[PDB]
Design a protein around this ligand. Structure first.
Ligand SMILES: OC[C@H]1O[C@@H](O)[C@H](O)[C@H](O)[C@@H]1O
Length: 293
């Protein structure tokens, strides 16, 4: 066994591969040994829970984790906190009310300001549409996930700001590229004059671009993603996507590791009612243009 463990959502998706690299790089800078694990894919909430439960019985001083849902990791995290494990919530906010109800807490929460993520994606949409506005839609992440909830809210708030913008659809596609092409096709059929789609992550955004291409509307419909994964940025630079709100998963993972290494010295876990540290990693809007001076 090692000193620290990390439980990510997946290990096959680019966003979570980059977070794994950020953690590994930070492990060399700090000189600590980190074991990184993940479920098979995006739907295996029960498998990630059993994976976390199996780790809490080794000898890790701290465990950072990004839960697949706000609920699947509530019990194993609470049991790890009661055991004295230094816990750090990564990216996806665990249900803190239920975690407290289960008798647990976390040292810190390292994430992106996802309300600003959605606001930036929608704000870039509102500017590009101009005074005409038009119909817009929001492709949501998995239901109940605070990351997607916050991006949805931020996009809705920025859209409600402009009076010529119409929110005709807001449906989940479960971070799934195939599901997003299906949902986006439905939106194109039910709202043929739709002008722009914001997507809670790039996996879905690329699938939306597939649906837009099938309908022959590439460029007629704006497609803004989130994460800044390589395929999405190459799509943004090739015109297949309009933009993407890039996150910094490497820094999210690297910071989460350093917090466990630092707080490991404190000799004490966080009290049950002390609100955890709240670290925000900035996000930048990636378009095919890049402005300087
Ligand atoms: O794994 C699905 C998605 O989860 C969110 O919490 C992350 O911020 C990324 O957008 C990721 O792509």
């Amino acid at each position: 066994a090692a000193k620290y463990a990390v439980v990510l959502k997946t290990l096959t998706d680019p966003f979570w591969v980059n977070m794994k690299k950020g953690i590994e790089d930070e492990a060399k800078k700090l000189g600590v040994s980190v074991d990184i694990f993940a479920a098979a894919s995006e739907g295996d909430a029960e498998a990630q829970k059993s994976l976390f439960e199996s780790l809490s019985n080794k000898n890790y001083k701290g465990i950072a984790f990004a839960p697949l849902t706000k609920d699947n990791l509530v019990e194993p995290v609470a049991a790890a906190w009661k055991k004295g494990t230094y816990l750090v919530n990564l990216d996806e906010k665990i249900d803190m009310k239920k975690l407290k109800a289960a008798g647990g807490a976390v040292e810190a929460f390292v994430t992106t300001d996802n309300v600003q993520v959605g606001a930036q994606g929608a704000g870039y949409i509102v500017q590009k549409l101009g005074a005409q506005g038009g119909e817009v839609a929001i492709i949501e992440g998995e239901a109940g996930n605070a990351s997607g909830e916050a991006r949805r809210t931020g996009a809705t708030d920025q859209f409600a700001k402009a009076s010529n913008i119409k929110l005709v659809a807001s449906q989940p596609a479960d971070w799934d590229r195939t599901k997003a092409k299906q949902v986006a096709t439905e939106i194109l059929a039910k709202n043929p004059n739709i002008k722009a789609i914001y997507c809670a992550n790039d996996t879905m955004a690329l699938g939306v671009a597939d649906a837009v291409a099938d309908a022959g509307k590439t460029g007629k419909v704006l497609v803004v993603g989130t994460d800044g994964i390589p395929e999405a940025q190459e799509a943004v630079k090739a015109g297949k996507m309009t933009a993407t709100v890039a996150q910094n998963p490497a820094a999210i993972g690297a910071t989460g590791l350093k917090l466990m290494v630092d707080a490991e010295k404190k000799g004490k876990v966080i009290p049950l009612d002390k609100a955890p540290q709240y670290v925000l990693v900035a996000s930048k809007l990636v378009t095919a243009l890049e402005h300087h001076h």
